[PDB]
Amino acid sequence: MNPKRIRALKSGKQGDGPVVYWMSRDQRAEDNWALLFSRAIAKEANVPVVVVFCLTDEFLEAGIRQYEFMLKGLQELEVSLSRKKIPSFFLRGDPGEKISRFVKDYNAGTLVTDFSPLRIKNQWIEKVISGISIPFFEVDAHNVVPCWEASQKHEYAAHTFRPKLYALLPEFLEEFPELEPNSVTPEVETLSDVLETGVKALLPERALLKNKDPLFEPWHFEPGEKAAKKVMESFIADRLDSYGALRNDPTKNMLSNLSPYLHFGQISSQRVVLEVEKAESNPGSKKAFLDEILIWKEISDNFCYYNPGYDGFESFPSWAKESLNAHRNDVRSHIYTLEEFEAGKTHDPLWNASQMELLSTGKMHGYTRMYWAKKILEWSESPEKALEIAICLNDRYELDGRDPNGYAGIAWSIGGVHDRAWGEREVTGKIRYMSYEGCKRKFDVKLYIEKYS
Numbered sequence: 001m002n003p004k005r006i007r008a009l010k011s012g013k014q015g016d017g018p019v020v021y022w023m024s025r026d027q028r029a030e031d032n033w034a035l036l037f038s039r040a041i042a043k044e045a046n047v048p049v050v051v052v053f054c055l056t057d058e059f060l061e062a063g064i065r066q067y068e069f070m071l072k073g074l075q076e077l078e079v080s081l082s083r084k085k086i087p088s089f090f091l092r093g094d095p096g097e098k099i100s101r102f103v104k105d106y107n108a109g110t111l112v113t114d115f116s117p118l119r120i121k122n123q124w125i126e127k128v129i130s131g132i133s134i135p136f137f138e139v140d141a142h143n144v145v146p147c148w149e150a151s152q153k154h155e156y157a158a159h160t161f162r163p164k165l166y167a168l169l170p171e172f173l174e175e176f177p178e179l180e181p182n183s184v185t186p187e188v189e190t191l192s193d194v195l196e197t198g199v200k201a202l203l204p205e206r207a208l209l210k211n212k213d214p215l216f217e218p219w220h221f222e223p224g225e226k227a228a229k230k231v232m233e234s235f236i237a238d239r240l241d242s243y244g245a246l247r248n249d250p251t252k253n254m255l256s257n258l259s260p261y262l263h264f265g266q267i268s269s270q271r272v273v274l275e276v277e278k279a280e281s282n283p284g285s286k287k288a289f290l291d292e293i294l295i296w297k298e299i300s301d302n303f304c305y306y307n308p309g310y311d312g313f314e315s316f317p318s319w320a321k322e323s324l325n326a327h328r329n330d331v332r333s334h335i336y337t338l339e340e341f342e343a344g345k346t347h348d349p350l351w352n353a354s355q356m357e358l359l360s361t362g363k364m365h366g367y368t369r370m371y372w373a374k375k376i377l378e379w380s381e382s383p384e385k386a387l388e389i390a391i392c393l394n395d396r397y398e399l400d401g402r403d404p405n406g407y408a409g410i411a412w413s414i415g416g417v418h419d420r421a422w423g424e425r426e427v428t429g430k431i432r433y434m435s436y437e438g439c440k441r442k443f444d445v446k447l448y449i450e451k452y453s
């Protein structure tokens with residue numbers, strides 16, 4: 001129980017009632033520092049712990065694919081917490097109104113939540129803080145090293161953040177204690193109903209084909225905490241060995257496929273890192289994978305935490321902004337609208353295949369994501385319109401979207417965040433370029449294009 005994982009958002013008079021865990025980003029019962037601290041605090045106060053989750057009004061800004069994945073897991077989570085004698089309350093509406101009202105209606109003693117550097121989460125904290133009188137803590141249950149501990153400032157490169165993070169692994173990379181149940185079960189609708197109503201409201205905006213057939217295939221990733229562990233186990237046993245050599249090959253499915261579970265916190269990245277560390281496989285593949293789930297994942301939280309405008313042109317490096325400004329007035333070879341990007345109606349069959357994989361599976365291969373976002377910059381009227389389009393399609397169709405990794409990944413592709421300058425070209429300037437022929441020499445593009453007609 002390292003106290004550096006927890007941080008106080010506001011101090012107050014601790015009440016004589018249950019400790020409330022405002023679960024948001026880490027939707028799991030196991031390996032959850034936020035829930036573990038909540039139980040520890042509730043134990044010292046001789047009071048039970050309770051979990052509250054808010055089904056917010058912004059769910060209509062995504063699709064059915066994300067909504068069902070999240071709620072199906074929450075249905076499983078409600079069963080796990082029950083076995084621990086921990087009740088779970090699911091509220092519908094504004095977290096500011098609902099969290100504050102729950103604190104007063106149930107006489108909460110202390111309020112706890114997990115950490116997310118996203119703007120929407122800060123928005124909720126502001127409203128909640130001004131509507132409660134009890135202490136309020138947040139715990140980093142998503143990063144191995146607490147975001148505010150890994151670095152005190154924005155890190156402009158992976159090689160400047162990698163040593164800082166590895167130096168702190170010996171202290172923060174540790175096993176998880178068991179979640180002790182509640183002593184006695186203490187004394188707002190069912191999830192099957194909130195799911196049915198939500199799906200009905202999302203159906204008109206469901207992505208379809210010409211024949212009114214849904215595009216999304218929901219049999220690629222089963223949601224839940226139990227499914228995530230099976231995915232983790234399969235990766236270490238079968239794919240981890242080849243990960244280092246086939247991570248950049250879209251035609252081969254040699255990725256961990258953990259992002260949907262990591263995004264919703266249905267599985268702890270610290271748990272994955274522990275299991276990987278103790279697994280014997282190709283050394284370079286271990287290094288490659290750990291580099292992605294430790295450095296690149298947690299540097300994205302670092303990006304969004306220390307850059308209020310992480311989703312804007314203002315957060316780009318100075319060299320990228322001055323380079324992109326110098327080529328604003330360059331004549332673009334193609335200009336596509338949002339609907340044209342969305343439907344995969346460009347001239348580049350590789351880009352359209354990447355969009356089709358996004359629409360059909362909700363998870364685009366890591367390598368094609370880079371190619372996908374860079375051509376949006378190349379075929380847009382400006383870098384600002386490119387960020388807008390990339391963020392829209394990413395957050396709308398990726399199962400792992402609306403995530404710090406997404407904004408940090410898009411900022412890398414379009415603005416060169418966490419990257420260096422390259423040969424100066426027109427339109428894209430010094431931003432790293434990825435040509436069509438460059439991909440042909442990297443993998444069998446024809447197979448990838450064929451798999452997503």
Ligand SMILES: Cc1cc2nc3c(=O)[nH]c(=O)nc-3n(C[C@H](O)[C@H](O)[C@H](O)COP(=O)(O)OP(=O)(O)OC[C@H]3O[C@@H](n4cnc5c(N)ncnc54)[C@H](O)[C@@H]3O)c2cc1C
Pocket residue numbers: 247255256257258259260262263292293294296297298300364365366367369370373394398400401402403405406407409410412413
């Ligand atoms: C334009 C663009 C958009 C992206 N969109 C998202 C997104 O919406 N959500 C998201 O979580 N990630 C995003 N990524 C990062 C990466 O593409 C995906 O995380 C990865 O493809 C997820 O699938 P996986 O778990 O099977 O990959 P794996 O190779 O098995 O890697 C495992 C984990 O390492 C992390 N990781 C891997 N690559 C990156 C990276 N470049 N940056 C940060 N973390 C990484 C992820 O957490 C990932 O789950 C994006 C990257 C780019 C360039």
